[PDB]
Ligand binder design. Sequence first.
Ligand SMILES: O=C(/C=C/c1ccc(O)cc1)c1ccc(O)cc1O
Ligand code: NA
Ligand code: NA
Length: 130
Amino acid sequence: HHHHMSTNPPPPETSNPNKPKRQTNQLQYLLRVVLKTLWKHQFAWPFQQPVDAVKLNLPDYYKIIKTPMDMGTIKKRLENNYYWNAQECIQDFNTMFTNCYIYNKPGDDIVLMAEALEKLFLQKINELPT
Ligand SMILES: O=C(/C=C/c1ccc(O)cc1)c1ccc(O)cc1O
Ligand code: NA
Ligand code: NA
């Protein structure tokens, strides 16, 4: 079974022509302010693209994580006006952080990074437009 090597699943979709979409002030804020400041963080790098289980040598990642999400996927979704409301985008951020905590253990370097971005994310969404 040497040909059976670890592979990544297809990444989450960033467009869907049959999904209803909207452009709200809150969604514009989520891209302009929330994502674009998190994106510039020193700890942002592990979350700027889907977990590449092949490259990072984590063949068990997608055996554990069944609803993957990352800021690269969120950024593309926000830029593509993929979302209907802010809650949908916020749920994607929540999913990204929770996956990191599920897959890893408290105190891991990746977890300490996720906790730091999560606290900044909650700070930034504390006040949304309207
Ligand atoms: O970068 C890593 C993991 C990132 C990550 C991102 C999101 C998650 O939900 C879980 C892990 C990583 C993991 C193991 C390793 O040896 C070297 C590495 O660089
Ligand atoms: Na865990
Ligand atoms: Na705010």
